[PDB]
RNA sequence: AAACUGCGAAUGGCUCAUUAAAUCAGUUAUAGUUUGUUUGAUGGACUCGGAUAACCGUAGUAAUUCUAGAGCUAAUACGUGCA
RNA sequence: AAUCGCACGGCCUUCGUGCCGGCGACGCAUCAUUCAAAUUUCUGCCCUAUCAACUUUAUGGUAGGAUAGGGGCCUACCAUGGUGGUGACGGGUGCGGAGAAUUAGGGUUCGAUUCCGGAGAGGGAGCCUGAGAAACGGCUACCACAUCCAAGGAAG
């Protein structure tokens, strides 16, 4: 929650019961938003944002899984990754195609299934690209011990239920798997997301 | 205060029971032209009755006024069946609960 | 700044009496279902009237607790016309 | 089938007036749903069998009603069941888990104040309100028990 992680970027001394004069002082942005709230919610790929002669920075995970800011360029910032978490099926080929973010989409676009992501710019709520889930591409790891590695799909298990696992070719060292839950995705041949250093 | 000629006209009264009221109602009246009343008033108040020392009547709120018609007014009872009769007992009614 | 309406007073606190139980734990099921508010989505500046508390003026079982006969007054709380 | 709070503009246009217009917070509707809910299941959860047969919508098939939603949850009708020598039904016990203490390890012990979930607010049932309560700081109201009294009635 974007108190927490702003309040995260602080961690030196003393705010907390005087937290709420920042949020008033409207120096604060998520996904390029006016938001000024103290019980507020964020969440991984949100991009926040500063000052007037200010910066950027995008909630991703420490190695552990918390979350917690990071510096972001002006360039990265414009754009947000948002994956697909659930859909209920269908118009003409729409899906109500759930994000993570908590985002809507009704409608093509053109593909999808849970675990694919969507590029988004953020100004217009224009859909770029969509990077699909499947081997070749690259992902980024949202949970657990295993938090905060990137690596390649090798090839994806399907089973009954659910689609168990996603095996990675990857590693500065070596091959590892995790469940689809886990797999955020972030590049493809066509586009990626990635130059950020590395990783096991 | 002060009378020429006037009459009530009793709306609703109503009562608290296992003590000791029942209550009276009017708007005294008078209307087109002219005035507040005795006789009228008195009328109602010893019918009220059956009564001795200093009546169990206790009238005195009288505002009309200057500017308007409207005043109501209406007089006071240990008990009475005229202050029963427009509203017969509720308020003991409105204690044996809800 | 006192009342009305919206959000809140259910969170929280503390005690294991009840308590061997799908009670609870851990895993799943849930399109077999809710989520107001919010974060997010989807829809969308003509004319208007209506009565009401505070304030008031007195009060009954009356010392009472309590609330009403009652003047006066304001409603993104209400009721509408509606592409 | 059935409004606030700041603006400022362009235009016939002196303040005149017509409709619209840049944000900041409304605001209602569930129309897929987010932090933040509930209801169910395959499992295990003390001792006593000088507790050894149990239970009567309590079990099962089918149809309503109910509810936010599952249903013998509630209710008709039909079937007479389902369970237990792998401990059912029943009795006693000076919260359950996360954990605590031991002891080299194993087990024993402990289960609690805290974290977590559940439950109840003198005892018990029911209800309004509100998104959410079956409510310690709301009511209703039987009973239990203190209290006020100008001893009528209130009152916790």
């Given at each position: 929650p974007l108190i927490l992680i702003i309040r995260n970027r602080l961690k030196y001394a003393?705010?907390?019961?005087?937290?709420?004069?920042?949020?008033?002082?409207?120096?604060?942005?998520?996904?390029?938003?006016?938001?000024?709230?103290?019980?507020?919610?964020?969440?991984?790929?949100?991009?926040?944002?500063?000052?007037?002669?200010?910066?950027?920075?995008?909630?991703?995970?420490?190695?552990?899984?918390?979350?917690?800011?990071?510096?972001?360029?002006?360039?990265?910032?414009?754009?947000?990754?948002?994956?697909?978490?659930?859909?209920?099926?269908?118009?003409?080929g729409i899906p109500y195609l759930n994000t993570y973010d908590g985002r809507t989409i009704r409608y093509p676009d053109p593909i999808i299934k849970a675990n694919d992501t969507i590029k988004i710019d953020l100004e217009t709520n224009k859909i770029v690209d969509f990077i699909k889930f499947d081997v070749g591409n690259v992902v980024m790891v949202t949970g657990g011990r295993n938090t905060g590695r990137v690596g390649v799909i090798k090839n994806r298990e399907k089973h009954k239920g659910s689609f168990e696992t996603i095996h990675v070719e990857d590693a500065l060292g070596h091959q590892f798997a995790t469940r689809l839950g886990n797999v955020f995705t972030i590049g493809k041949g066509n586009k990626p997301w990635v130059s950020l250093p590395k990783g096991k | 205060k002060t009378a020429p000629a006037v009459t009530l006209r009793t709306r609703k009264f109503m009562t608290?029971?296992?003590?000791?009221?029942?209550?009276?109602?009017?708007?005294?009246?008078?209307?087109?032209?002219?005035?507040?009343?005795?006789?009228?008033?008195?009328?109602?108040?010893?019918?009220?009755?059956?009564?001795?020392?200093?009546?169990?009547?206790?009238?005195?709120?009288?505002?009309?006024?200057?500017?308007?018609?409207?005043?109501?007014?209406?007089?006071?009872?240990?008990?009475?069946?005229?202050?029963?009769?427009?509203?017969?007992?509720?308020?003991?009614?409105?204690?044996?609960?809800?």
């Open positions: 003393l705010t907390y019961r005087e937290v709420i004069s920042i949020l008033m002082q409207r120096h604060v942005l998520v996904d390029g938003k006016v938001r000024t709230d103290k019980t507020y919610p964020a969440g991984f790929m949100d991009v926040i944002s500063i000052p007037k002669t200010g910066e950027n920075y995008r909630l991703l995970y420490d190695t552990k899984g918390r979350f917690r800011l990071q510096s972001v360029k002006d360039e990265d910032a414009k754009f947000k990754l948002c994956k697909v978490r659930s859909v209920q099926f269908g118009q003409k | 608290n029971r296992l003590l000791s009221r029942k209550q009276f109602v009017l708007e005294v009246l008078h209307p087109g032209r002219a005035n507040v009343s005795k006789a009228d008033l008195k009328e109602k108040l010893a019918k009220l009755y059956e009564v001795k020392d200093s009546n169990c009547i206790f009238v005195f709120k009288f505002r009309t006024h200057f500017g308007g018609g409207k005043s109501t007014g209406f007089g006071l009872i240990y008990d009475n069946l005229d202050a029963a009769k427009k509203y017969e007992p509720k308020y003991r009614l409105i204690r044996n609960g809800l």
